[PDB]
C-alpha cells in the first residue's frame, strides 16, 4: 500500500528484493518513467509482499555490473494499464508493469562489501543473487543505508 513513513525509518515493516536487469537501457527507462516488470513468478511474490509489508524495496543490479545501481520502492501492484508495451516484445514474457519510486542512484560494488553471504539464498555470495532474490532485513537495511551514503549519480546524464 501507500507509504506512511520514510523507508529508512525504523517503525515500518520492510522486505528487500534484488532485481537483475540484462540491459542498462531498461534501468534508464525505469528511472525515467518510474516503472518495472518482472517474471510472472516474481510478480506474484512481489505482489504478496506489496500488500502485506509497509515498504517493499527493490535493489537494482544490472547483469555483470558487479554491484548495485541504486534502489527503489514498489509503489503499486502489477497494472495492465501502466505504460503498456514499454519494454517491447519481452513484455509478452513478463508480468504486468508496476510503479517504482527510485530512492537512490549510486555505484557500489559487491566486492566493496567483502565476504557477504545471504542466509536466505543458501549462504551464497551477494554477487550470485538472481532476479527476485530476497535478502534478510538486517542485511537489506544495511545495503540501502550504505547505498544512500554514496554520492547520488545521475545515471541518465
From TrEMBL:
GO CC annotations on file: nucleoplasm
Transmembrane segments: none
Keywords (A to Z) from UniProt: Metal-binding, Zinc, Zinc-finger
Coiled-coil region list: none
Domain YTH intervals: 14-147
GO BP, sorted A to Z: mRNA splicing, via spliceosome; regulation of mRNA splicing, via spliceosome
Source organism superkingdom: Eukaryota
GO molecular function: mRNA binding; N6-methyladenosine-containing RNA reader activity; zinc ion binding
Protein name, UniProt field: Zinc finger (CCCH type) motif-containing protein
Species per Swiss-Prot/TrEMBL record: Toxoplasma gondii (strain ATCC 50611 / Me49)
Portion of the full-length sequence here: 434 to 589 of 640
Amino acid at each position: 500500500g501507500d507509504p506512511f513513513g520514510h523507508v529508512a525509518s525504523p517503525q515500518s515493516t520492510k522486505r528487500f528484493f534484488i532485481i537483475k536487469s540484462n540491459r542498462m537501457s531498461n534501468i534508464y527507462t525505469s528511472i525515467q518513467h518510474g516503472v518495472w516488470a518482472t517474471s510472472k513468478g516474481n510478480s506474484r511474490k512481489l505482489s504478496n509482499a506489496f500488500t502485506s509489508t509497509d515498504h517493499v524495496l527493490l535493489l537494482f543490479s544490472a547483469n555483470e555490473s558487479g554491484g548495485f545501481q541504486g534502489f527503489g520502492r514498489m509503489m503499486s501492484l502489477p497494472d495492465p494499464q501502466l505504460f503498456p508495451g514499454i519494454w517491447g516484445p519481452v513484455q509478452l514474457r513478463l508480468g504486468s508493469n508496476f510503479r517504482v519510486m527510485w530512492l537512490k542512484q549510486c555505484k557500489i560494488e559487491f566486492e566493496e562489501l567483502g565476504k557477504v553471504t545471504n542466509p536466505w539464498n543458501d549462504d551464497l555470495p551477494l554477487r550470485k543473487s538472481r532476479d527476485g532474490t530476497e535478502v534478510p532485513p538486517a542485511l537489506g537495511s544495511l545495503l540501502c543505508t550504505w547505498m544512500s551514503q554514496r554520492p547520488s549519480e545521475d545515471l541518465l546524464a
